[PDB]
Design an enzyme around this catalytic site. Structure first.
Site, short mmCIF file in Angstrom:
data_model
loop_
_atom_site.label_atom_id
_atom_site.label_comp_id
_atom_site.label_asym_id
_atom_site.label_seq_id
_atom_site.Cartn_x
_atom_site.Cartn_y
_atom_site.Cartn_z
CG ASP A 155 -1.95 1.13 1.15
OD1 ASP A 155 -2.36 1.51 0.02
OD2 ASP A 155 -2.28 1.66 2.25
CE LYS A 201 -2.43 5.16 0.69
NZ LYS A 201 -3.70 4.76 1.43
CG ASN A 253 0.70 4.56 3.49
OD1 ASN A 253 -0.06 5.06 4.33
ND2 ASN A 253 0.34 3.53 2.74
CG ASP A 275 -1.34 2.01 6.57
OD1 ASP A 275 -2.25 2.49 5.85
OD2 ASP A 275 -1.51 1.03 7.32
CB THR A 331 0.98 -37.07 -6.25
OG1 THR A 331 1.34 -37.35 -4.88
CG2 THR A 331 0.95 -38.38 -7.05
C1 LIG Z 1 2.48 18.71 9.97
O1 LIG Z 1 2.00 17.86 11.02
C2 LIG Z 1 1.41 16.58 10.72
C3 LIG Z 1 2.00 15.31 11.25
C4 LIG Z 1 1.40 14.05 10.94
C5 LIG Z 1 1.99 12.84 11.42
C6 LIG Z 1 3.17 12.90 12.21
N1 LIG Z 1 3.86 11.65 12.64
C7 LIG Z 1 3.34 10.36 12.29
N2 LIG Z 1 4.02 9.18 12.74
C8 LIG Z 1 2.13 10.28 11.50
C9 LIG Z 1 1.62 9.01 11.11
C10 LIG Z 1 1.12 8.86 9.72
C11 LIG Z 1 0.55 7.58 9.26
C12 LIG Z 1 0.48 6.43 10.17
C13 LIG Z 1 -0.16 5.10 9.64
N3 LIG Z 1 -0.99 5.15 8.47
O2 LIG Z 1 -0.13 4.08 10.26
C14 LIG Z 1 0.98 6.58 11.56
C15 LIG Z 1 1.55 7.86 12.03
C16 LIG Z 1 1.46 11.51 11.05
C17 LIG Z 1 0.23 14.01 10.06
C18 LIG Z 1 -0.35 15.27 9.53
C19 LIG Z 1 0.24 16.53 9.86
O3 LIG Z 1 -0.32 17.73 9.38
#
Ligand SMILES: COc1cc(-c2cnc(N)c(-c3ccc(C(N)=O)cc3)c2)ccc1O
Length: 284
Positions: free
Chosen positions: A121, A123, A126, A142, A159
Site C-alpha cells: 500500500d 502511496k 504513507n 502503514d 503427486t
Molecule cells: C504537519 O503535522 C502533521 C503530522 C502528521 C503525522 C506525524 N507523525 C506520524 N508518525 C504520522 C503518522 C502517519 C501515518 C500512520 C499510519 N498510516 O499508520 C501513523 C503515524 C502523522 C500528520 C499530519 C500533519 O499535518
C-alpha cells in the site's frame, strides 16, 4: 475517553490525521504519535508483529501498543507530516529533493523485501517526513496491508498426478509479488517529479483499469521537459507492465539517476544527525 492504561503514560493532545493523534509521553515529556484503530484484529496483530521486528532509519518504529475498546499504536512522531501534502494540487518538488526522498524509499523497501515483507500500500500519504526542512529523512508507514512471504513450494514436490493445470502455470510467475511495490514506487516517483498522476481520469476517455494494464500513462512533455532524462528513464523502468521485467529495488538503486554522491552525502549527514540523540560512547 481513552483507556486508563493509555492515559497513564501519555497525555493525549490534538489530531494529526483521519485517526492519528498527537501525544506526550509522561516519563520524558517527548512528543509521540498515536494511531487509533477501532474494532480488524488481523491487520493489527501483524502490523505490530512486523513493526516490532523491523529495524531501519526509513521505517517507522513502534513505541508502545494498547489493546482496548479500540487499538492504540504509539509511534515515533514525524514532524514534516505526509509526503502527500507536498504534492497534492499539482505542487511539485525540485528534482534534487525527489532523488533524496526516493533514494530513502528504495532503501526502505529493499529492506522489507530482503526480510520477506511486501508493503502493498505504498502511496504519498504513507511516506512521512522527519521535519519541515525539505532536507530531511523520510519514513515508510502503514503496514496494515503487508503480506509476508510456500503453499506452491510444498504442492510442488509431490503427486502432480492430481494437480490442476492452472496451478503449474501459476509457477512461472510465482514468487514475484514484491514487484508490486516497485510499481507503486514508480507511480510515486512520477507524481513527485511531475506534479501530476500517471494514470488519472482527468481529461481522458480510456478507462483507468485500461491505462494501467496497457502501461500507457498520460505523458505531458511540457512539465516533463523540466525534468532530466536520467530521472524519467527510471520512472519508465519501474512502470513496466510485466513484473518479471520490471525493475527491482536493487536495479533501481543501481540506476544512473541514483549514482549521485551529493544526495547520498546529504543522507549520510542527515542520518548521523538523527543518531546524535542515541549516540552511545563506544570502544576505540
Ligand atoms: C504537519 O503535522 C502533521 C503530522 C502528521 C503525522 C506525524 N507523525 C506520524 N508518525 C504520522 C503518522 C502517519 C501515518 C500512520 C499510519 N498510516 O499508520 C501513523 C503515524 C502523522 C500528520 C499530519 C500533519 O499535518
Amino acid at each position: 475517553v481513552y483507556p486508563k492504561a493509555l492515559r497513564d503514560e501519555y497525555i493525549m493532545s490534538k489530531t494529526l490525521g483521519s485517526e492519528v493523534k498527537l501525544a506526550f509521553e509522561r516519563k520524558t515529556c517527548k512528543k509521540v504519535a498515536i494511531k487509533i484503530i477501532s474494532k480488524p484484529a488481523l491487520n493489527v496483530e501483524t502490523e505490530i508483529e512486523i513493526l516490532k521486528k523491523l529495524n531501519h532509519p526509513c521505517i517507522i518504529k513502534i513505541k508502545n501498543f494498547f489493546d482496548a475498546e479500540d487499538y492504540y499504536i504509539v509511534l515515533e512522531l514525524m514532524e514534516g507530516g505526509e509526503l502527500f501534502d507536498k504534492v497534492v494540487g499539482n505542487k511539485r518538488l525540485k528534482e534534487a529533493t525527489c532523488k533524496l526522498y526516493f533514494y530513502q524509499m528504495l532503501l526502505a523497501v529493499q529492506y522489507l523485501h530482503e526480510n520477506g515483507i511486501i508493503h502493498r500500500d505504498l502511496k504519498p500519504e504513507n511516506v512521512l517526513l522527519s521535519s519541515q526542512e525539505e532536507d530531511c529523512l523520510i519514513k515508510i508507514t502503514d503496514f496494515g496491508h503487508s503480506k509476508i512471504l510456500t503453499s506452491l513450494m510444498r504442492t510442488l514436490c509431490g503427486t502432480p498426478t492430481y494437480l490442476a493445470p492452472e496451478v503449474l502455470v501459476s509457477v512461472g510467475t510465482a514468487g514475484y509479488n514484491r514487484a508490486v511495490d516497485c510499481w507503486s514506487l514508480g507511480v510515486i516517483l512520477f507524481i513527485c517529479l511531475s506534479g501530476y498522476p500517471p494514470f488519472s481520469e482527468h481529461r481522458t476517455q480510456v478507462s483507468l483499469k485500461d491505462q494501467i494494464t496497457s502501461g500507457k500513462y498520460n505523458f505531458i512533455p511540457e512539465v516533463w521537459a523540466e525534468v532530466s532524462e536520467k530521472a524519467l528513464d527510471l520512472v519508465k523502468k519501474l512502470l513496466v507492465v510485466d513484473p518479471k521485467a520490471r525493475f527491482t529495488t536493487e536495479e533501481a538503486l543501481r540506476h544512473p539517476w541514483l549514482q549521485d554522491e551529493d544526495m547520498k552525502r546529504k543522507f549520510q549527514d542527515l542520518l548521523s544527525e538523527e543518531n546524535e540523540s542515541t549516540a552511545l560512547p563506544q570502544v576505540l
